[PDB]
Each structure stands twice: as C-alpha cells, then as structure tokens.
Design a protein around this nucleic acid. Structure first.
Length: 252
DNA sequence: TAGTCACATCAGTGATCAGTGGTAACCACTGATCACT
C-alpha cells in the first residue's frame, strides 16, 4: 500500500541503513552479521517474492517500468470525491491574492496548507503572516509527535486557519476541512521535491469535497504539467462516473 | 536527511512500614530509747 512512497522508502531506507551499518561494522560497533540483518534489498526481494501486487495513489515509475506501462485504474470514487481545481500563477505578486482569498474563504473556517523550499524565507513568511493579523502554524525538520497531535486537536477545535510546512506534511496529516493548498516555487530541482510531492498535495486537496491548488513557478517542467494533465483527466472521468452515480453517500 | 530505521538495561534516585536496633511497695531488720510494773 502507498507503494509510490513505499518502494522509494524501501530503497532509501536500505541505502541509509547500509551506510550506517558500514559506519558501524567498519568502525567497530557491530559484526557483518548486523549488516546482513537489514531491510530486504530489492534484488533479493524480487528473488524471494511471488505474485506481487502493488497499490498506491499514483503510478510509481519503478512499477510502471516493471509492468511495461499496463496497469489498472480504480481511483474513481463512488463516494463522490473529485480532484482539486488548478490555478497557476507566477511566484511573485501572490501575497495580496492569498490574503484576499483567505478573507473571502474564512467564513467557512477551513485550513490552508502552504509550502516553501528552505527554512529562512519560510519563517519570514510565517512571522509576517502572523503579523498582519492571521493565526498561523508552522512545521520544522525535527517535528515530534505531540507538537502536531496537539495541532490536530486544536484544529478540530478551530483555533487557527493556516499551516505551513516543507517536508513534515505527507505523514498522516489528514484533515476533513482542507480546501485550498498553495505550492510556492517548488518547480526547482530537488531530491525531496520532485513530482510525487506535488501529486500528493493534489490528492490531499482532492480528498476534500472541493479542493483547490495554487501553484507558483518561475519555470515550467514537464513533470508538473503531465501530473496536472493526468489529474485533470482523472477528475473528468470521476465527474462523468459520479454524474451517473448521483445517489447520496450511505456509509455503513 | 528525510518518519521510522532493533533491541533492553545501569544509576543512585522519594515514602513507609517492616521487623534489628536502645526498657513502691515489700514491709523483710535491727537497734535506740522507751511505756509499764
């Protein structure tokens, strides 16, 4: 499940653990048996697995290469969930528009998630945007469990309206009342900011009854536009399916 | 540098009971002085 971030997680975790295991065994901390005591490498994983089934919100490049591109699509939600609308704007000239949109939308008392690249201008935005009169919360690189479980509690208590985070946002931060999400200058190359994070934020906005993404780029890359195109076509398919399945949801 | 990434094991740390450390008659005596005839 969530293979798009599970298989890359397996690879990266194996790489990091084998690096630290070399740093241990070579520098006298553990035996090479501890190096053998490791998460499964992908070669031996393939050598050991049988009928392998993958499942994720997005088609992983490794899975697509392994399967040749032929997959099965079931991302359509009979429950009535659609992908978010997309607005693309330049990086500059956006703060006034954001303030106007949050003033117009705050009557619903929802939450808006924003992202940046590194810490300095991110925190500059945070203290400025708490200065001009909006309650804001931020995420850092060393977020512990309590400091955002309390964030979840106080957002279900409706104590603020906006969250900002760079990397501490893809792990279990589900919220039933997040409508608009802003992506700021993520077009630049990064080992931790390629297309999967943008599609993950798109899906996070999608899980709402009415999502929205505001995407700011100095330059346009093929990955983001292909992701937007596939998201839009999937949303069109979901809307077409839901137009026939007009029955209201009946949870059971 | 990303959320977890395997696996218990030492240190001297309060409060308090628990269970090692600290516990005048009798009138029996005999003598002195003495009340008595």
């Amino acid at each position: 499940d969530e293979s798009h971030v599970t298989v890359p997680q397996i690879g990266g975790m194996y790489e990091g653990d084998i690096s630290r295991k070399r740093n241990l065994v070579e520098y006298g901390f553990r035996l090479p048996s501890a190096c053998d005591n490791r998460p499964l490498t992908w070669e031996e994983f393939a050598d050991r697995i049988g009928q392998t089934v993958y499942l994720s919100a997005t088609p992983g490049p490794y899975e697509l290469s392994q399967t040749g591109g032929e997959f099965v699509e079931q991302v359509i939600r009979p429950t009535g969930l659609v992908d978010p609308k997309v607005v693309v704007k330049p990086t500059k000239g956006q703060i006034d528009d954001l303030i106007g949109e949050i003033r117009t939308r705050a009557d619903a008392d929802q939450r808006v998630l924003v992202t940046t690249l590194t810490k300095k201008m991110a925190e500059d935005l945070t203290d400025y945007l708490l200065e001009m009169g909006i309650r804001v919360r931020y995420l850092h690189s060393e977020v512990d469990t309590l400091r955002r479980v309390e964030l979840l509690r106080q957002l279900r208590l409706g104590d603020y309206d906006v969250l900002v985070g760079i990397n501490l946002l893809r792990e279990g931060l589900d919220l039933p009342e997040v409508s608009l999400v802003a992506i700021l200058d993520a077009d630049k190359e990064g080992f931790l900011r390629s297309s999967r994070s943008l599609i993950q934020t798109i899906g996070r906005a999608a899980r709402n009854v009415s999502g929205e993404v505001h995407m700011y780029a100095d330059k346009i890359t093929d990955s983001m536009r292909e992701a937007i195109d596939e998201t839009e076509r999937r949303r069109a398919k979901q809307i077409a399916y839901n137009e026939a399945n007009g029955i209201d949801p009946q949870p059971l």
